[PDB]
Design a protein around this ligand. Sequence first.
Ligand SMILES: CC(=O)/C=C/C=C(C)\C=C\C1=C(C)C[C@H](O)CC1(C)C
Length: 265
Amino acid sequence: SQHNILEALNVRVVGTGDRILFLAHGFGTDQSAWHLILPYFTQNYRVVLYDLVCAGSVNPDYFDFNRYTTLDPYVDDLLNIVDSLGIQNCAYVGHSVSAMIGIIASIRRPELFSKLILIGFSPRFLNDEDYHGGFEEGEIEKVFSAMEANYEAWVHGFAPLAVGADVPAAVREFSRTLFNMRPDISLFVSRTVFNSDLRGVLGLVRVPTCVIQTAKDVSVPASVAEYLRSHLGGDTTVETLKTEGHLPQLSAPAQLAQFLRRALP
Ligand SMILES: CC(=O)/C=C/C=C(C)\C=C\C1=C(C)C[C@H](O)CC1(C)C
């Protein structure tokens, strides 16, 4: 139930250091997205990885549509893993939805995180009055229709856009993990995430935070970076990668590793 979570979400611990580094993947991927970055840190860090319940590498029977209606159960899962491993202090790297999860988690448990590293992070995707998130409700409904009508065609068109840079290996990988997801789960999670809004709680963040924005993220306008600088409550830094795309850990691992290396405690 809540009790076999380590096996259910493929929790793996690698590396040698005392300092615990948590690598948390985002939408459409699983923990294998970190495999190019991982060798940069395993000599100096104790690295914890897991898969979100919605990952295609997780048994889809674990995805309870009745439960996973907001981000809060996802946060519960993260903290359950943390507590189950007996982790009292760690550095946390969250990509995409895992960035959103980490924000909430750090408000709940400020003492747990020495540092938040947020990659491809947005507090809100939908545009509001005086807020450019990058999407509109009508647009999103058409995406959901395409996903339902022919998920695989959608993935085929989407994966290259999301990877952004001309790195076929990265596109192929992101496609693979998207195709592994059960289509109805992908759609449901997308609905959940698109209708989330963390703008109200950004000021409550107390933990030191590094935001790593990419050059041209389909999910995150450049304006969001400055917004986060203005609104995040903790000691915050914002930095921009020179490479384009939503998935730097696959498309530009050397550059991402460099940024991480100097941001990490
Ligand atoms: C079709 C199109 O161009 C618009 C993208 C539509 C998808 C479904 C967006 C998916 C996601 C991206 C990849 C990264 C975000 O962090 C989380 C979120 C669920 C919003």
